[PDB]
Design a protein around this ligand. Structure first.
Ligand SMILES: [K+]
Ligand SMILES: [K+]
Ligand SMILES: [K+]
Ligand SMILES: [K+]
Ligand SMILES: [K+]
Ligand SMILES: [K+]
Ligand SMILES: [Mg+2]
Ligand SMILES: [Mg+2]
Ligand SMILES: [Mg+2]
Ligand SMILES: [Mg+2]
Ligand SMILES: [Mg+2]
Ligand SMILES: [Mg+2]
Ligand SMILES: [Mg+2]
Ligand SMILES: [Mg+2]
Ligand SMILES: [Mg+2]
Ligand SMILES: [Mg+2]
Ligand SMILES: [Mg+2]
Ligand SMILES: [Mg+2]
Ligand SMILES: [Mg+2]
Ligand SMILES: [Mg+2]
Ligand SMILES: [Mg+2]
Ligand SMILES: [Mg+2]
Ligand SMILES: [Mg+2]
Ligand SMILES: [Mg+2]
Ligand SMILES: [Mg+2]
Ligand SMILES: [Mg+2]
Ligand SMILES: [Mg+2]
Ligand SMILES: [Mg+2]
Ligand SMILES: [Mg+2]
Ligand SMILES: [Mg+2]
Ligand SMILES: [Mg+2]
Ligand SMILES: [Mg+2]
Ligand SMILES: [Mg+2]
Ligand SMILES: [Mg+2]
Ligand SMILES: [Mg+2]
Ligand SMILES: [Mg+2]
Ligand SMILES: [Mg+2]
Ligand SMILES: [Mg+2]
Ligand SMILES: [Mg+2]
Lengths: 85, 240, 77, 164, 202
RNA sequence: ACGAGCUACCCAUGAGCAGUUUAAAAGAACCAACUCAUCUAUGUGGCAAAAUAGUGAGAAGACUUGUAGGUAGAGGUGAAAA
RNA sequence: GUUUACCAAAAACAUCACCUCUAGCAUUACUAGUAUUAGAGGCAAUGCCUGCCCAGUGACACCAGUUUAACGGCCGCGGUAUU
RNA sequence: AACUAUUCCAAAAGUUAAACAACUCAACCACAAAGGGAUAAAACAUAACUUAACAUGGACUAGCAAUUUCGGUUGGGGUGACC
RNA sequence: AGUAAGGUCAGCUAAAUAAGCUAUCGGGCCCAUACCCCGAAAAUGUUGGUUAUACCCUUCCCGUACUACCA
């Protein structure tokens, strides 16, 4: 959420502008839970999955501040309890 | 406040059902369509558009029904006729010359040579002759009749190619449809509905039309006699 | 065909379950302990109500085939 | 010089090429790039192909040269016809030019039965002859070479060492 | 994902304190959008040989969309993690020590697939006597089928051929997979004449 | 933020129109209840922040009317009088 | 018939009629309808009529072009039959 | 600007892929064709096309609409004139 | 009143390279006239200034045109 200048000129009109991420519908597979979740994911999330070399690695390596999703924390907590138990 | 639509009945019944007018107000409560409201109270008759509907799935063969009476329907501009067969009754749109004590045949068997076209029979477009007048056109198999239901409106079949029928709508626009769709042969009743003359302003209020607004709007560029080529044929056949 | 139901008039379907119930081997945290709604807590799923003692007026109507005189043959009255 | 032909010169330069026979004994020409480069091997192979595809021993080798006769300056140079007699003429020959001006020339070199050394000597003379039209060093004049016989396909000659 | 920066400078706060944000600090400008960049490729390790990609235990930099949709979900490939690479590298050592790979290279597998369904036209000219030898047969692969065949790889049925007919040729790639391709010896024709007579007419 | 208990329009649910003239319950005709408010005179801090007296137009319809619900100010509503 | 409740009740608006324009169709308006239908407008019953003009503008076609019951337009100077 | 509608590009999803204009003038071959006098390379280092419903970023057109002003002197202002 | 604005052969137009059409004058064709063919003549409203002139400006004159409003 923010403002912008038309024509990228300072002396121009000030305009309210909202930028929204492009959402995609994908289903992901987790080895720890062996269940498929249809989760609204973004292209950045998929890149982070490949960067961590695994969907479970992405959840278990990224901290809370990086994830910013209650579903992710519950997904981590479900798998974290699975390993400990 | 959100309102509730009066279309809450779930089971089909031949008896008239209660009807509540809208007046152009949407569910929110604001005017969306002007010039509607303040009409005479009306009751709605449950009209069965799907001509071919067996009573039970045990015997899917063609069945023949009998016409009891032809009544006047306040909702639509045509005349509906009560039709009974087996253990149920149905309200279907009457053709030009349907009367009491008449027998109507409903069938779907696509025969190779032909089938004689009667004034009330409903046959699939694959069996009708080339030069046949039809109404209550079914756009897709099993969807039901949607097109050509106004008073006096009749479409004419044009040709059947590669197992597909092409018809002419009342708007003189060709339409392509699978030949297995059910259609009714004839012209819709109340032919002289177009020739009816309204004698006074009050009769418009009785029908349920409110007078137009008095604001004087200068004509824009949209006005004027426009000559435009006919749009291309609309086809509902999904080519694989 | 043209079914005579209307989406708005028909009873709405139950809301989708929360994501917590989809995670295997994870006990959800619900507000059923405080017996009142609270935002941020998962919606409980309760078993169908089973009154120990049947009440004549307030019980659900018995099925038609439960009647002793129910017969498969269709008789016309 | 038009940009349309500049793209074509870029495309032909971008075609992959590898040296030597790959590890696989049998492989598709689609999968692996051109391999045959040596002039001496190419001339012997054409004579070999005459044995493999039994025909007359005498064959006119109509060499195809993908000469870069453009991109000297922003304005293209015009085609010409330089005539120079080869040291081993076959039984002054004009250097024809493409009708479509697609930067390829088809000029006969010598007969198949001629020795490889003489044919290679004729090839070197042709390289100097075609470059005589634009001897400037600003831009390359030869891109690819394809030596084909009457009953054989061309081979990607490693013409880069023979340019000077 | 969009990337923006503020038009107006923000005053500093160097003691680990949150800086003051004003209304004029909300004015952003789009400097770059991540979706418009030329996207890269994804390297994956194949756990099963693909029809057009590499073989079991190979490194392929396939397109990013393909890996996420058909390769990884179906198990044909796994992530090319540094720990994952050495497992296949160690796995290769066991087979190649005793020559037990029998998997061919990335192109080698495609050679087997193409040769499984192919027919070679061995055009010979009857004006001069011709005898078929493995060197001659390999020539027709390059011209007709576009196949480069090593002279020793071909194993003819050892029967001399002097007339047109139908025969069979044995083709072996890397000494591991043996392919028996049909052989069709017909009268030779000039491709310029052949394509004019048949392709142009029909 | 709060307002459609006045008013503009609409959705529900109710309730009124006697006599007279005509094959007529015909947006016909005479005239009350009823509803509007043409003309003039009183009134002008008045009985009244728009009324009283006389006189008028419609009065089986595009008519009056009770209860209750809906549309809210960058709008609602309007047989356009901004 | 309707309107400026509280200075204008009218020649204003509406109206039957005629005409132009936009749309081939499903679960909350239009509509539980389907071009003899439904919207966005003009002009005002009936009767006799509604002439000429696509250059400009607008719209359509989205190219040539086509449209005025679309906005709008619909001429000078000089001489000539005794006067 | 937002918003509604039209159109394009990008993102996204999917589909297919290894390619054609001789003519024998001599002359071999019983044919069908052949040889001498050309039978290359290449397709594109990916390319091409399709994509319903939703929907992101960047542009184009139109509708609707937003912000803000409308100079001065003048034998009172406007008009003419002047600075 | 103010402002705007024009004058060109007898007539009407286009250019300032003063042209084109018609009218007028002479001749031919026809029984005669007209049509038609051929040939000739003809002007920049006015004064002054525009290197010098003309299309320009200025003066004079004729005539054309708009506006003259709030109380
Ligand atoms: K009707
Ligand atoms: K209310
Ligand atoms: K009072
Ligand atoms: K009145
Ligand atoms: K026009
Ligand atoms: K004064
Ligand atoms: Mg209706
Ligand atoms: Mg109207
Ligand atoms: Mg009007
Ligand atoms: Mg400090
Ligand atoms: Mg109220
Ligand atoms: Mg009465
Ligand atoms: Mg009356
Ligand atoms: Mg009133
Ligand atoms: Mg009174
Ligand atoms: Mg009075
Ligand atoms: Mg009196
Ligand atoms: Mg009266
Ligand atoms: Mg009256
Ligand atoms: Mg409110
Ligand atoms: Mg408003
Ligand atoms: Mg009103
Ligand atoms: Mg007005
Ligand atoms: Mg006004
Ligand atoms: Mg009146
Ligand atoms: Mg008033
Ligand atoms: Mg009054
Ligand atoms: Mg008429
Ligand atoms: Mg009239
Ligand atoms: Mg009027
Ligand atoms: Mg009038
Ligand atoms: Mg007219
Ligand atoms: Mg035009
Ligand atoms: Mg955008
Ligand atoms: Mg501002
Ligand atoms: Mg001013
Ligand atoms: Mg002033
Ligand atoms: Mg003054
Ligand atoms: Mg002025």
């Amino acid at each position: 959420l923010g403002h912008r200048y038309v024509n990228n000129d300072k002396l121009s009109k000030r305009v309210r502008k909202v930028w929204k991420p492009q959402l995609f519908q994908r289903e992901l597979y987790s080895e720890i839970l062996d269940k498929r979740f249809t989760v609204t994911v973004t292209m950045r999330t998929l890149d982070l999955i490949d960067q961590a070399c695994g969907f479970d690695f992405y959840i278990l390596k990224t901290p809370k501040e990086d994830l910013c999703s209650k579903f992710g924390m519950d997904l981590k907590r479900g798998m974290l309890l699975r390993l400990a138990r | 406040a959100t309102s509730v639509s009066w279309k809450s009945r779930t089971k089909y019944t031949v008896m008239p059902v209660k009807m509540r007018k809208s007046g152009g107000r949407n569910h929110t409560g604001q005017i969306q369509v002007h010039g509607i409201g303040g009409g005479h109270k009306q009751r709605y008759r449950m009209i069965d558009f799907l001509r071919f509907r067996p009573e039970h799935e045990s015997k899917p063969g063609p069945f023949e029904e009998k016409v009891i009476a032809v009544r006047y329907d306040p909702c639509r501009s045509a005349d509906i006729a009560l039709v009974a067969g087996g253990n149920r009754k149905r309200w279907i749109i009457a053709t030009e010359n349907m009367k009491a004590g008449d027998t109507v045949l409903n069938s779907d068997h696509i025969g190779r040579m032909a089938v004689a076209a009667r004034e009330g029979d409903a046959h699939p477009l694959g069996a009708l002759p080339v030069g046949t007048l039809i109404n209550n056109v079914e756009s897709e198999p099993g969807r039901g009749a949607q097109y050509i239901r106004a008073a006096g409106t009749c479409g004419v079949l044009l040709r059947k190619v590669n197992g597909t029928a092409i018809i002419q709508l009342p708007s003189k626009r060709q339409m392509q449809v699978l030949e297995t769709c059910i259609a009714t042969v004839g012209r819709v009743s109340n032919v002289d509905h177009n020739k009816r003359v309204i004698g006074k302003a009050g009769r418009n209020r009785w029908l349920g039309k409110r007078p137009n607004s008095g604001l004087w709007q200068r004509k824009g560029g949209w006005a004027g006699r426009k000559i435009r080529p006919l749009p291309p044929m609309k086809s509902y056949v999904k080519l694989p | 065909a043209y079914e005579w139901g209307v989406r708005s008039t028909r009873k709405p379907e139950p809301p989708p379950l929360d994501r917590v119930y989809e995670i295997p081997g994870l006990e959800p945290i619900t507000y059923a302990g405080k017996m009142h709604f609270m935002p941020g807590l998962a919606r409980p799923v309760f078993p169908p109500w089973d009154p120990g003692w049947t009440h004549p007026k307030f019980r659900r109507l018995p099925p038609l085939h439960e009647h002793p005189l129910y017969k498969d043959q269709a008789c016309y009255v | 010089a038009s940009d349309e032909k500049k793209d074509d010169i870029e495309k032909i330069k971008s075609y992959p090429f590898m040296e030597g026979e790959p590890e696989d004994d049998v492989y598709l020409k689609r999968l692996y790039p051109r391999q045959i480069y040596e002039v001496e091997k190419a001339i012997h192979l054409l004579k070999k192909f005459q044995v493999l595809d039994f025909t007359n021993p005498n064959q006119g080798v109509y060499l195809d040269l993908t000469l870069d006769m453009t991109l000297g300056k922003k304005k293209k140079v015009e085609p010409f016809a330089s005539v120079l007699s080869l040291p081993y003429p076959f039984t002054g020959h004009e250097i024809k030019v493409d009708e479509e001006r697609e930067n390829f020339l088809e000029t006969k070199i010598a007969t198949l039965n001629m020795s490889s050394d003489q044919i290679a000597a004729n090839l070197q003379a042709v390289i100097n002859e075609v470059c005589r039209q634009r001897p400037l060093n600003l831009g390359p004049f030869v891109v690819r070479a394809f030596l084909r016989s009457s009953t054989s396909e061309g081979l990607l000659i490693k013409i880069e060492p023979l340019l000077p | 994902t969009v990337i923006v920066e503020r038009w107006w400078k923000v005053p500093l706060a160097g003691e680990g304190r949150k800086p003051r944000l004003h209304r004029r600090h909300r004015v952003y400008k789009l400097v770059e959008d991540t979706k418009h960049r030329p996207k890269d490729n994804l390297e994956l390790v194949l756990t099963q040989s693909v029809e057009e990609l590499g073989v079991r235990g190979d490194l392929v930099s396939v397109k990013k969309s393909v890996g996420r949709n058909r390769l990884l979900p179906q198990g044909l490939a796994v992530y090319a993690s540094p720990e994952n690479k050495k497992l296949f590298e160690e796995e290769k050592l066991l087979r190649q020590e005793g020559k037990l790979e029998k998997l061919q290279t990335k192109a080698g597998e495609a050679t087997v697939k193409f040769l499984r369904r192919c027919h070679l036209e061995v055009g010979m000219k009857n004006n001069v006597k011709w005898e078929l030898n493995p060197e001659i047969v390999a020539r027709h692969f390059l011209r007709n089928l576009g196949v480069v065949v090593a002279p020793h790889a071909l194993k003819l049925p050892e029967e001399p051929i002097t007339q047109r007919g139908e025969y069979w040729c044995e083709v072996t790639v890397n000494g591991l997979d043996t392919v028996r391709v049909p052989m069709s010896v017909v009268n030779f024709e000039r491709p310029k004449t052949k394509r004019y007579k048949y392709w142009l007419a029909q």
